[PDB]
């Protein structure tokens, strides 16, 4: 997991539970707690989050903005693969593997693509028609 | 560099030069020759290629089929990012980063999408109109 992977999951946990426990981060990323503590320290140093005494892990404004961006990117990519017809079961793992290796330019263009299809269902129908061609013929 | 990264580059060198030198593979993947030798041995064990006392490394039919599919995948993804409007200069690095992490289902669906736009320019024009809209 990259730094973006950690911030993405920390943001999600804070929104889901209201806080992000090291044990919960470790579970979400399927890694050892030590790996989390190491990354958390790096994120603290880079000012993405803090840990004032008790209370707990808290994202800084910089961490919150990036986290929101990452969840947006994840959601958008799933919608993209869903719209173009990828089997639902395969969508998550694919987004997991590509999301943090795409420039913002690509993300924003994929965003335009999604809007393109959402704007007129007729385009989705024509796309399905093409899938039928490339299917047999 | 993953196993697929190596096969993709080896296939390309063979198509370009007619052979894949360890040094050319190291330069293409920006890695040390030692890492190449290690990977080549793994690829040999896995039967993707073999070594010849006079022709260097040769891909087996399994390696050739994979290599061809990898180059197809790379080219397809570049065309996809290109048709949807990504700045040309950013396309290569994006494809390099995602290409070997997409299922065939996704690759084939992206293939249909490319055909969808290549079939009627009006669709390209309409996508451009939306980009102007999302631009506000
Ligand atoms: Zn994600
Ligand atoms: Zn490639």
Curated annotation (Swiss-Prot), chain A:
Cell compartments where the protein resides: Cytoplasm
GO cellular component terms, semicolon-separated: cytoplasm
GO-annotated biological processes: intracellular manganese ion homeostasis
Keyword line: Activator, Cadmium, Cytoplasm, DNA-binding, Manganese, Metal-binding, Repressor, Transcription, Transcription regulation
Reported effect, residue 5 to M: Binds only one manganese ion, in a pseudo-hexacoordinate geometry
Binding annotation for Mn(2+) 2: 8, 74, 96, 99
Stated consequence of mutating residue 8 to K: Retains selectivity for activation by Mn(2+) and Cd(2+) over Co(2+) and Fe(2+). Can bind Mn(2+) in the C site, despite alteration to the A site, and adopt active DNA-binding conformations
Main location: cytoplasm
Binding sites annotated in the UniProt record for Mn(2+) 1: 5, 96, 99-100
Covalent S-S links between cysteines: none
GO molecular function terms attached to this record: DNA binding; DNA-binding transcription factor activity; manganese ion binding; protein dimerization activity
Gene knockout outcome: Null mutant is very sensitive to manganese. Mutant also displays increased sensitivity to cadmium.
Functional note: Central regulator of manganese homeostasis that regulates the expression of both manganese uptake and efflux systems. In the presence of high levels of manganese, it mediates repression of the manganese uptake systems MntH and MntABCD and activation of the efflux systems MneP and MneS. Binds with high affinity to the regulatory regions of its target genes. The manganese concentration required for activation of efflux is higher than that for repression of uptake.
Matches recorded under PANTHER family: IRON (METAL) DEPENDENT REPRESSOR, DTXR FAMILY, TRANSCRIPTIONAL REGULATOR MNTR
Record remark on domains: Contains an N-terminal DNA-binding domain and a C-terminal dimerization domain. Contains two metal binding sites per subunit, site A (corresponding to metal ion 2) and site C (corresponding to metal ion 1), which both contribute to the metal selectivity of MntR. A large metal cation is needed at the A site to correctly orient and position the C site ligands. Smaller, non-cognate metal cations bind at the A site, but disrupt the C site, blocking the full activation of MntR. Binding at the C site also favors Mn(2+) and Cd(2+) over other metals.
Similarity comment: family membership: Belongs to the DtxR/MntR family.
UniProt protein name: HTH-type transcriptional regulator MntR
Organism: Bacillus subtilis (strain 168)
Swiss-Prot record, chain B:
Residues annotated for Mn(2+) 2 binding in this entry: 8, 74, 96, 99
Result when mutating residue 74 to A: Retains selectivity for activation by Mn(2+) and Cd(2+) over Co(2+) and Fe(2+). Can bind Mn(2+) in the C site, despite alteration to the A site, and adopt active DNA-binding conformations
Alphabetized HAMAP family for the sequence: HTH_MntR (MF_00732)
Binding positions for Cd(2+) 2 per the UniProt entry: 8, 74, 96, 99
Keywords attached to this entry: Activator, Cadmium, Cytoplasm, DNA-binding, Manganese, Metal-binding, Repressor, Transcription, Transcription regulation
InterPro entries reported in the protein's UniProt record: DtxR_MntR_Metal-Reg (IPR050536), Fe_dep_repressor (IPR001367), Fe_dep_repressor_sf (IPR036421), HTH_DTXR (IPR022687), HTH_tscrpt_reg_MntR (IPR022897), Iron_dep_repressor (IPR022689), WH-like_DNA-bd_sf (IPR036388), WH_DNA-bd_sf (IPR036390)
Pfam families named in the record: Fe_dep_repr_C, Fe_dep_repress
Domain HTH dtxR-type: 1-60
Domain comment as written in the entry: Contains an N-terminal DNA-binding domain and a C-terminal dimerization domain. Contains two metal binding sites per subunit, site A (corresponding to metal ion 2) and site C (corresponding to metal ion 1), which both contribute to the metal selectivity of MntR. A large metal cation is needed at the A site to correctly orient and position the C site ligands. Smaller, non-cognate metal cations bind at the A site, but disrupt the C site, blocking the full activation of MntR. Binding at the C site also favors Mn(2+) and Cd(2+) over other metals.
Chain's role: Central regulator of manganese homeostasis that regulates the expression of both manganese uptake and efflux systems. In the presence of high levels of manganese, it mediates repression of the manganese uptake systems MntH and MntABCD and activation of the efflux systems MneP and MneS. Binds with high affinity to the regulatory regions of its target genes. The manganese concentration required for activation of efflux is higher than that for repression of uptake.
Name this polypeptide is given: HTH-type transcriptional regulator MntR
UniProt-annotated binding residues for Mn(2+) 1: 5, 96, 99-100
Superkingdom per UniProt: Bacteria
GO biological process terms on file: intracellular manganese ion homeostasis
Entry similarity comment: Belongs to the DtxR/MntR family.
Phenotype reported upon loss of the gene: Null mutant is very sensitive to manganese. Mutant also displays increased sensitivity to cadmium.
Metal-binding keyword on record: yes
Activity regulation statement: DNA binding is strongly activated by Mn(2+) and Cd(2+), but it is poorly activated by non-cognate metal cations, including Co(2+), Fe(2+), Ni(2+), Ca(2+) and Zn(2+). In the strict absence of divalent transition metal ions, MntR has a low affinity for DNA.
Record note on quaternary structure: Homodimer.
Compartment annotation: Cytoplasm
Effect of residue 5 to M: Binds only one manganese ion, in a pseudo-hexacoordinate geometry
Annotated residues for binding of Cd(2+) 1: 5, 96, 99-100
Gene Ontology molecular function: DNA binding; DNA-binding transcription factor activity; manganese ion binding; protein dimerization activity
């Amino acid at each position: 997991p990259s730094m973006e992977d950690y911030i993405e999951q920390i943001y999600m946990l804070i929104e889901e539970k209201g806080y992000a426990r090291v044990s919960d981060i470790a579970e979400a990323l399927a890694v050892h707690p030590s790996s989390v503590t190491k990354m958390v320290q790096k994120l603290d140093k880079d000012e993405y989050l803090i840990y004032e005494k008790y209370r707990g892990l808290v994202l800084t404004s910089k961490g919150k903005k990036i986290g929101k961006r990452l969840v947006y990117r994840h959601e958008l990519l799933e919608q993209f693969l869903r719209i173009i017809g990828v089997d639902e079961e395969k969508i998550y793992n694919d987004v997991e593997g590509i999301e943090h290796h795409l420039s913002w330019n690509s993300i924003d263009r994929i965003g335009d693509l999604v809007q393109y299809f959402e704007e007129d269902d007729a385009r989705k129908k024509d796309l399905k028609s093409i899938q039928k061609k490339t299917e047999h013929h």
